[PDB]
DNA sequence: TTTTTTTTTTT
């Protein structure tokens, strides 16, 4: 079973080949693999647990079936196919192997008693880990007549003690020495089933998983991962005392890989160093598109294909993804400054509000979904729970910190009573929340960027009232906000005729990777700085803003505003990775500003 | 004794005989013990009734042990396996029995089981609660001792047990006198488990008395039939719990069967007959429905016509990723005493999942979704309200004018995305709440009345009236004949109970409810040559309430409407195309709903 | 059988 099994695994790693394409024949597929793992750190080798179905079928009825009795064998027929750079680079810790699957394999509730200790696949999203657990490996022994070591390792499962010095032989004199034996580390997470995938009128689940040595912090909760490991089960005594054990044992999931990257969503920011890794094909792409003279609305008019017309929406929305530059202020003692936008969108119902807020949710990754009435005060930032099983008061974090790089999506903005709407005052302009509690005072921090959606007051844009009347929020939250997005329903016949015309073609029946990848690119290899031509007409476009905004009632306008056109005119810059904001990023940032609120 | 027993139930399970097979006289349990000795069956519900046919003394000593017998029959199974196709006779047994009731006993309640029917095969009926989840339980333990290369067993019957350290094999402590055993969990046989609580009923409960509880500890095959909050009817030993004289009682599940419908679940005699399929076929199948909903009520031809479709639903789509409701909502608005509440209380009896709820009575924490802390854990737990109980169905709301205005807008959430985002301070999800509602209200203080407009009488925000395809319009102005005609039907009803018989007769309750439940998966498309016609009905709505001085406000919602209101029709009709015919019933409809008020 | 924090029904 065993060295019939690495003489079968060698085969595959050495030949096999796809019909498919990596990183935007090369026939040595995971022997490219295992040379990157030679060129650079990161012992892992990530195998795919299906390429291993076409190549084979029976070592994959044995790989998802003795999981634990192969995956060493899938270390060691590593290890010696490792030849090639032997000499060349000899790194220390070993080469690894960790099966996985592309798409899901069960659900939180259909895991039966068959599955026991067997490779499963589910997925989730991870609520809360824990700090770390000590978990002891090879015992060392001292006797105290003969004061003789011995190191015993722990091979089945439990540590024996041997009970004869091998010196003095007392019969018993060996105590066990904690702090000069070896410890690995331990972690406890807990998934939780994903909205969709669950029957119907039903609550999620929980399924505690186990980390092991090297993926002990490879999660944050907020996070939607697809877990695979294997699947056990370990009895439980009913007195810490007797060894009267139940018969309802209790399962949890020793994790071997973890996979966050969705095809659907953009890229999270755990591949920085992967924007390296894109196809010198793929920059000559991008520089290129970015050089059309309407890149701005070529990109913009492809998000959300379902939406009619809408043109400036988008094009904030589009602005909302990249943001302004990520300056460093800690010499000027002001602090942080923030570099993500704000957008509000107020207009009379039937309008696709939510259906922006719905859409923009399911592309962004590490992004949350919020309502009116269903969102406390304390659920958005920061709660006090009593910890069940230490009895003790410790933190956690609500929705705007577990977006954190991503947007906040807040619908039905206006149906808060007003304590639970101030407390956005803070996380919305100084990325920042302090906490002050019974025995936590402390001081967290995040990088979210608000999207919310509100109706006018009495839900009817009445055009008798002013503008700073129909939407009834305050000065000191409107000026939080830099982009008032005021949606109406004019009667115009033709635009009704067309919008009618569109809607129904949606019952009968530009490429997603340009943009998901121009947004990679944009973000990693850009800082547009300003320039003494722009920075001249942003002076300018503050001093008229005032003079109009004053009289009208609509909304006045204060300081931050003049930051706002800053966070804006960067953020026009980034799109065409012009490096250096000039004139014209302003004149259009400014445009932007001026013609939504009309 | 019980040896000769072992033969009077082998002669039974081979000799039985059935008719109903539709073929000629075969063998009941001749085939199942086949398919069980394939292994492509694992559990084998022998009927009580099939043995009282013709042997109704066993019956009378099965309910009277029933624990001793439910052995017996195991025994006698497990023999005849081998004649038609390890160590203990259990750890090789892959299959298991259960008792399907005795029809001359009478479903008791849980208040009526008492001491003297400890051991016997009852039977109750009651509502589900905290069904937990399912766990492997331990049935043979299998130990190894790895010093002498065996293998040993020990079953186990209590709820907990102590393993052993012996490794009883004389000759491996003969030959040294020294070995431990280790426990492992892939030789051993574990088999489903969860328990569940049951409620009596707090209908058939004294008048002010509290409701018992009982357990039920599910296991095996009829794990996963029963969800929370739910009526069901159970079949199983009363048994006492194992560890001075009290005892603590559980129930042992047998049988669960669920009666939801008040008789039972159908759904495998749910398909239709040819003879059926006749009225099916008919011209009008859409117009007999429509009159015999609630036929003890006279008039109202064109709202029971809305209430079917209400019953039967559009289709959904999700173009681009962008989803469209294929639920129906309507309300009520109508003057005192036009029996709303009628109607509402038998469309809430005519749908599988439905839910009842009243305006006055109801928190808006209660309908959507609460979150909840136990004083025993002190640890937050979720708890559905009603849109979530009520999932796949319909949902019921009178008095709805009267509803707390802050309990009321948390609707607009379950109206169109049809999910409930929770971020209170324990929780952070969103539950899948596809419900469609329905709701009575009274017009302005009671009654309508012509001085003010709409808008004034009915008293929702734009908002809200909105998201109700149908806002149906009732009047009772006095008619010196109609009258008539009413108080000689209602008079009718008086005397015999029953509606006066018109040329033809109501379908029954049971029969309409699978001739929708097969009217519901059809899927009918749009046919792109009438996207002209549509789009012209629609353009004309948005000229007449924009030219007129009562009309509600219309918006790009409405076509909507006139899209899933059509393809409700379309699938009643059982075609697989929406046809120019259905959008003009369709056209009618949101035209007769404010027609009573000219 | 005590504080403190957080949610929901009630006067
Ligand atoms: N311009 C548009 N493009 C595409 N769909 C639209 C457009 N206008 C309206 N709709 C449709 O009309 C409906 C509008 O619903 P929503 O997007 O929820 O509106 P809303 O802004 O959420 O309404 P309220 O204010 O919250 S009740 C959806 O079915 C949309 O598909
Ligand atoms: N057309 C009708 N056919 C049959 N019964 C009717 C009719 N009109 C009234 N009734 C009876 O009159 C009573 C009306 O009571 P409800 O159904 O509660 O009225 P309602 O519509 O709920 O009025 P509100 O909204 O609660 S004041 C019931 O007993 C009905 O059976
Ligand atoms: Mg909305
Ligand atoms: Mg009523
Ligand atoms: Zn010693
Ligand atoms: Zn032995």
């Given at each position: 079973n065993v060295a019939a099994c690495k003489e079968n695994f060698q085969r595959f790693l050495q030949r096999f080949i796809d019909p498919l394409a990596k990183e935007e024949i090369t026939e040595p597929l995971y022997m490219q693999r295992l040379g990157e793992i030679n060129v650079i750190g990161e012992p892992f080798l990530n195998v795919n647990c299906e390429h291993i179905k076409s190549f084979d079928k029976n070592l994959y009825r044995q790989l998802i079936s003795y999981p634990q009795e192969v995956i060493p064998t899938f270390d060691m027929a590593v290890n010696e196919i490792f030849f090639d750079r032997y000499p060349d680079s000899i790194l220390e810790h070993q080469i690894q192997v960790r099966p996985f699957n592309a798409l899901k394999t069960k659900?939180?509730?259909?895991?039966?008693?068959?599955?026991?200790?067997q490779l499963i696949t589910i997925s989730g999203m991870v609520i809360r880990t824990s700090q770390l657990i000590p978990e002891m490996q090879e015992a060392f022994f001292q006797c105290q007549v003969c004061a003789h070591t011995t190191r015993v390792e722990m091979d089945r499962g439990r540590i024996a003690e041997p009970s004869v010095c091998g010196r003095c032989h007392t019969t018993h004199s060996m105590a066990l020495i904690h702090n000069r034996s070896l410890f690995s580390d331990k972690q406890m997470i807990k998934l939780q089933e994903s909205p969709e995938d669950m029957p119907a009128g039903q609550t999620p689940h929980t399924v505690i998983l186990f980390a092991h040595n090297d993926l002990v912090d490879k999660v944050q909760p907020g996070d939607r991962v697809n877990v695979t490991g294997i699947y056990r089960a370990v009895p439980i005594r009913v007195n810490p005392r007797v060894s009267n054990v139940k018969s309802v044992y209790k399962t949890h999931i020793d994790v071997i890989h973890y996979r966050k990257t969705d095809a659907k969503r953009l890229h999270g920011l755990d591949e920085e160093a992967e924007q390296k890794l894109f196809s010198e094909k793929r920059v000559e792409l991008l520089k290129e598109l970015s050089r059309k003279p309407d890149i701005y609305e070529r990109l913009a008019s492809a998000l959300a294909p379902s939406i009619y017309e809408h043109e400036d929406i988008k094009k904030g929305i589009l602005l909302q993804l990249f943001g302004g530059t990520r300056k460093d202020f800690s010499h000027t003692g002001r602090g942080k400054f923030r570099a993500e936008i704000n957008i509000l969108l107020c207009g009379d119902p039937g309008t696709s509000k939510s259906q922006l807020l719905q859409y923009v949710y399911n592309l962004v990754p590490r992004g949350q979904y919020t309502s009116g009435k269903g969102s406390s005060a304390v659920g958005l930032t920061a709660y006090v729970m009593k910890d069940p099983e230490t009895r003790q008061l410790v933190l956690q974090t609500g929705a705007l910190v577990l977006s954190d790089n991503g947007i906040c999506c807040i619908d039905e903005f206006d149906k808060m009573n007003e304590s639970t709407r101030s407390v956005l005052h803070e996380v919305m302009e100084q990325q920042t929340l302090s906490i002050a509690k019974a025995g936590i005072i402390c001081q967290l921090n995040a990088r979210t960027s608000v999207l919310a959606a509100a109706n006018p007051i009495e839900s009817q844009w009445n055009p008798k009232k002013t503008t700073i009347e129909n939407i009834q929020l305050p000065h000191t939250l409107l000026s939080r906000f830099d982009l008032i997005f005021l949606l109406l329903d004019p009667q115009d016949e033709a635009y009704d005729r067309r919008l009618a015309h569109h809607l129904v073609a949606l019952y009968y029946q530009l490429d997603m990777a340009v943009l998901k990848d121009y947004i990679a690119y944009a973000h990693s290899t850009i800082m547009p700085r300003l320039s003494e031509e722009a920075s001249q007409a942003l002076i300018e476009a503050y001093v008229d803003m005032r003079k109009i905004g004053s009289s009208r009632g609509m909304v006045s306008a204060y300081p931050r505003q003049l930051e706002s056109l800053i966070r804006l005119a960067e953020a026009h810059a980034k799109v065409r990775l012009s490096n250096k904001v000039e004139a014209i990023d302003v004149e259009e940032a400014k445009r932007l500003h001026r013609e939504a609120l009309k | 004794d019980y040896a000769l027993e072992k033969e009077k139930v082998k002669k039974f399970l081979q000799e039985f005989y059935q008719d109903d097979e539709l073929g000629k006289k075969q063998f009941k349990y001749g085939n199942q013990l086949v398919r069980l000795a394939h292994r492509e069956q694992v559990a084998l519900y022998v009927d009580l009734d099939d043995v009282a046919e013709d042997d109704p003394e066993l019956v009378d000593s099965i309910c009277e042990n029933a624990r001793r017998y439910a052995k017996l029959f195991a025994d006698a199974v497990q023999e005849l396996l081998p004649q038609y196709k390890q160590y203990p006779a259990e750890l090789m047994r892959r299959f298991e029995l259960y008792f399907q009731g005795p029809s001359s006993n009478k479903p008791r309640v849980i208040r009526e089981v008492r001491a003297d029917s400890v051991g016997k095969l009852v039977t109750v009926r009651g509502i589900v609660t905290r069904v937990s989840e399912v766990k492997p339980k331990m049935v043979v333990a299998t130990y190894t001792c790895d010093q002498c290369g065996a293998e040993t067993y020990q079953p186990i019957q209590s709820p907990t047990f102590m393993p052993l350290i012996m490794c009883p094999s004389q000759e491996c402590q003969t030959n040294r006198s020294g070995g431990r055993l280790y426990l492992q969990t892939r030789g051993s046989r574990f088999i489903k488990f969860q328990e569940m609580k049951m409620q009596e009923h707090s209908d058939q409960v004294p008048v002010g008395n509290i409701p018992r509880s009982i357990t039920v500890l599910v296991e095996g095959e009829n794990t996963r039939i029963a969800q929370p909050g739910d009526h069901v009817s159970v079949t199983g030993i009363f048994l006492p719990i194992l560890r001075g004289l009290l005892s603590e009682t559980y129930l042992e599940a047998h049988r669960i069967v669920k009666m939801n419908k008040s008789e039972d679940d159908e759904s495998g005699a749910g398909e239709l007959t040819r003879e059926e399929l006749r009225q099916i076929a008919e011209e009008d199948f859409y117009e007999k429905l429509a009159a015999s909903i609630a036929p003890e009520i006279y008039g109202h031809e064109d709202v029971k016509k809305a209430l079917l479709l209400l019953l039967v639903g559009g289709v959904d789509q999700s173009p681009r990723g962008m989803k469209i409701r294929g639920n129906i909502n309507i309300c009520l608005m109508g003057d005192p005493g036009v029996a709303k509440s009628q109607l509402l209380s038998y469309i809430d009896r005519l749908a599988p999942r439905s839910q009842y709820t009243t305006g006055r009575g109801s928190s808006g924490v209660g309908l959507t979704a609460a979150v909840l802390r136990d004083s025993v854990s002190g640890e937050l737990t979720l708890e559905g309200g009603a849109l979530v109980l009520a999932d796949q169905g319909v949902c019921c709301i009178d008095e709805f004018d009267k509803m707390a205005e802050a309990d009321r807008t948390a609707i607009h959430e379950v109206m169109e995305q049809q999910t409930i985002s929770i971020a209170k301070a324990g929780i952070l999800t969103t539950l899948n709440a596809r419900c469609s509602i329905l709701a009575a209200a009274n017009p302005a203080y009671g009654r309508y009345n012509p001085r003010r407009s709409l808008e004034q009488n009915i008293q929702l925000p734009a908002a809200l009236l909105s998201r109700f395809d149908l806002l149906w319009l009732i009047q009772d102005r006095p008619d010196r004949d109609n009258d008539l005609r009413l108080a000689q039907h209602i008079t009718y009803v008086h005397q015999h109970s029953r509606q006066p018989p018109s040329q033809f007769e109501p379908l029954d309750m049971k029969l309409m409810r699978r001739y929708i439940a097969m009217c519901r998966e059809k899927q009918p498309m749009v046919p792109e040559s009438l996207a002209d016609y549509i789009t012209a009905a629609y353009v004309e709505m948005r000229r007449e309430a924009w030219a007129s001085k009562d009309a509600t406000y219309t918006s790009a919602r409405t076509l909507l409407a006139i899209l899933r209101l059509s393809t409700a029709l379309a699938r009643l009709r059982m075609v697989d195309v929406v046809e120019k015919e259905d959008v003009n019933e369709a056209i009618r409809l949101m035209e007769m709903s404010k027609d009573s008020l000219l």
């Open positions: 659900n939180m509730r259909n895991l039966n008693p068959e599955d026991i200790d | -």
